Design an enzyme around this catalytic site. Structure first.
Site, PDB file in Angstrom:
ATOM      1  N   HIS C 184     -47.508 -34.646  11.856  1.00 50.43           N
ATOM      2  CA  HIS C 184     -46.096 -34.943  12.070  1.00 50.43           C
ATOM      3  C   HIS C 184     -45.307 -33.709  12.480  1.00 50.43           C
ATOM      4  O   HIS C 184     -44.195 -33.839  13.004  1.00 50.43           O
ATOM      5  CB  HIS C 184     -45.487 -35.552  10.807  1.00 50.43           C
ATOM      6  CG  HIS C 184     -44.098 -36.075  10.994  1.00 50.43           C
ATOM      7  ND1 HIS C 184     -43.728 -36.827  12.089  1.00 50.43           N
ATOM      8  CD2 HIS C 184     -42.988 -35.957  10.228  1.00 50.43           C
ATOM      9  CE1 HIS C 184     -42.451 -37.149  11.988  1.00 50.43           C
ATOM     10  NE2 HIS C 184     -41.978 -36.633  10.868  1.00 50.43           N
ATOM     11  N   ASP C 188     -44.597 -36.909  16.963  1.00 49.55           N
ATOM     12  CA  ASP C 188     -43.621 -37.768  16.318  1.00 49.55           C
ATOM     13  C   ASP C 188     -44.254 -39.115  15.982  1.00 49.55           C
ATOM     14  O   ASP C 188     -45.418 -39.380  16.292  1.00 49.55           O
ATOM     15  CB  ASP C 188     -42.404 -37.957  17.219  1.00 49.55           C
ATOM     16  CG  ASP C 188     -41.947 -36.665  17.852  1.00 49.55           C
ATOM     17  OD1 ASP C 188     -42.093 -35.605  17.207  1.00 49.55           O
ATOM     18  OD2 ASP C 188     -41.451 -36.708  18.996  1.00 49.55           O
TER      19      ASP C 188
END
Lengths: 209, 209, 213, 208, 212
Positions: C184, C188
């Site tokens: 992450h 995204d």
């Protein structure tokens, strides 16, 4: 000599389905053929645990009940030469994976004639199997000095009423000969019925009913 | 920390059948009621028996893998004041009845709160029955110093495929969160598969596959 | 893992009707032509390469020493082998060129090498994307462990017959869950979801690979 | 000593024979066909197959005496009681001769003119308890033989043949044998041989 | 089985009529006579009217050194067996030929509570003719009994099982019972035993041959 025999019917379908479902993996892992005799030996051990009077004996010399706590079941692997009864010792701590191993080794001993004298005495139960020859139902003979013997007969498909409806199921007639001088009819009938319940549904062995 | 999670699904049709047929007998003989938890605890014990790596725990002080012959499952019991994780010891020597009896005595101790610390320490494997509160699936949190835990969830009727047909069966998710350092992918999934197999039909436990 | 790094594993279901039916009605010719085998490993590897081409960010690895993204271009799929001595992860380089047959040949070669314990340390690391297999041991789904310094990993699991609604009617179809453990910090939610859906589209219908969609 | 094992026989071929050959017997032999001869001949075939069941333990000197002749001691009901005449050398007779011997023994028995030489020397007994209507039960071995095959009533009972339930004429067959001479397996196979021979009379012709 | 001439013969009994009889009349007995309908009142009666014709069963082998002459008794007394937890005794009905089905159950039940409380006098157990082994407790198939000496014959209690049977060449599942009767061969013929076995199983499914 006083032999009293009680008969009963055992539904063979559940254990046959269990064998058909699990025979492949069992043979792959333990290298043993899955048979219906291990279920019967385990059920006999369980019912003997529940009802120890069938495991006792009365000494004719002193006229007193002799209780036995260890469970030894002698199987009949009778060779074409004659009747032989190898003994399985301490069956109360064995599973279906065992017993099959022990009966296999004892049968091997019987075929190759290493069945020594001590291997046929000191049994507490006998599970003589006369169904390999297709007998419907008959009365076996009490093996002395034991006080009971369970006779397994052949498996045949007969119509049985299940919920008021006729269904063809594989069923076994099972016998139990007892001496009325030690075991009364109530006790032996309950013992045979409990063996029937344990073979008919193997999960009660886990549930300890 | 370093925890990974893998999932499977268990079909509770034989557990449901055996709790539909053997409740009256269980109550009459043991004065106790039968539940799902005993099946899962026994399945976990069997899987740990046949795969001793998950039973083992890496100690952080010396970086040694430590095997243990004994198995003690840390079942969590619901209490109004707070969730507790007692330990039931030697799961390999008990059947469903003994598991049920020890869980019942543990619960009746927890209700009045006389639980000493001696009954709370020494954990090897933890099971958290999250089925009392409807839960689909999710990653459980381990209770150290042990390595992996099995998280149960709610049982929901869902459509599945058995031989190409679609039927509604009571089926629930199982998650096994495991310390990735000691347990790799293959045993982390084989362990869960064996638990699934032993819960789907308890006859595997008796037959010792 | 979980708290050690950012997993945020995303999941999707991939139907296997197309691939299984193709191999069912195409395996004999393949055995008579190249002689190895025919499996879904090649399909998944090539689909991963296609999706990695379409989304170049997932290919890029982060450099924690410098906090710089390194836009790696060559696709290096590193596959896993379930050897008797646990599990080993060799690598395949320049995946875009191979279509199905060369990936299958490399898979067979690497598997035979691992079974023989000749996997050199050269063709063992340096990948840009990893694919695990929890399918040989039937697992419904699970969270894959990211292989560093790579930035993502495909975690496909076993194939099971499940009832799936197609056009308002329930019909049993060979389904399987697939997982992606991204980072992450760099990828995204949008990019990882699009990655998984593109791999799903490229396995559900292999002609997309030819069409470039 | 005494010990018994049971089985069942599908009596469908014998009833078909009696249906298709009663008038031929009546107009060629002047006697009535019955299912006694089928069991007598089946017992003879089984005795020929297993000579062990045809043996005897002699309590005089503890010896196992083998007998070559086969004699089935059929039971004949009389108002005075139960007289059991012995039909001799059953190996060399088919159904017609067995029926002839049975008719002769019945005629001679009803007149109270059956002598003492016609009681003794039997080597196998057959007790037809089905004329009275029993389901099954235990017969007794008359001395000095070693086994007895008792038949019972023929009852229409549902059986699972081919996986389906159908009503068929079936009877229960039991033999009581001493354990000192005949083993359990021998008795089971003996009863099964009798079952096969009665269930399919062509087995007697095929000698299997 | 050897003992003293202890053969056994087996048969079945139809219990569709009796349960049909009891499914309609249970309320009447509870109101008028305060006791419940059982099974033994039908089997103990079926045996009794089976003995009034052939009294060879009532005969016992007694006198000096056993086998001398028959001892025919003109009285019928059936020894029904009831289970305690303190070893099964056999209680006994006296002069029971002339008393009907209800007097067979009032006598049985109040005499059952008579031994549930250990109010027992040995004078009420004299050696009469016959015992009917009451085995209606434990749901099983086929027993062998042991003629409770000096009694010469013996009855069984077997259990009602739904069993597929051929009624009028048609398969019609009815719930059936088996029976046996253990005969002393000495002075008791095999053929006459089947006849009493049949009629103790004929007066049972058609309760009205008791009136005929």
């Amino acid at each position: 000599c006083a032999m009293l025999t009680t008969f009963n019917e055992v539904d063979m379908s559940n254990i046959q389905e269990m064998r058909a479902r699990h025979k492949d993996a069992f043979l792959k892992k333990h290298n043993l053929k899955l048979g219906f005799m291990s279920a019967f030996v385990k059920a006999s051990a369980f019912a003997l645990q529940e009802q120890p009077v069938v495991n006792a004996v009365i000494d004719d010399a002193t006229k007193e009940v002799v209780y036995r706590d260890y469970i030894d079941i002698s199987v009949a692997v009778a060779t074409p030469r004659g009747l032989v009864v190898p003994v399985i010792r301490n069956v109360e701590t064995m599973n279906y994976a065992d017993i099959e191993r022990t009966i296999n080794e004892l049968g091997e001993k019987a075929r190759k004639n290493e069945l020594a004298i001590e291997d046929m005495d000191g049994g507490t139960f006998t599970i003589s199997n006369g169904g390999v020859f297709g007998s419907l139902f008959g009365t076996p003979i009490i093996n002395p000095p034991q006080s009971a013997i369970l006779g397994m007969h052949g498996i045949f498909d007969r119509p049985v009423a299940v919920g008021g409806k006729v269904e063809v199921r594989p069923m076994m007639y099972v016998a139990l000969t007892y001496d009325h001088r030690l075991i009364d009819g109530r006790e032996a009938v309950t013992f045979l019925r409990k063996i029937k319940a344990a073979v008919e549904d193997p999960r009660v062995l886990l549930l300890d009913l």
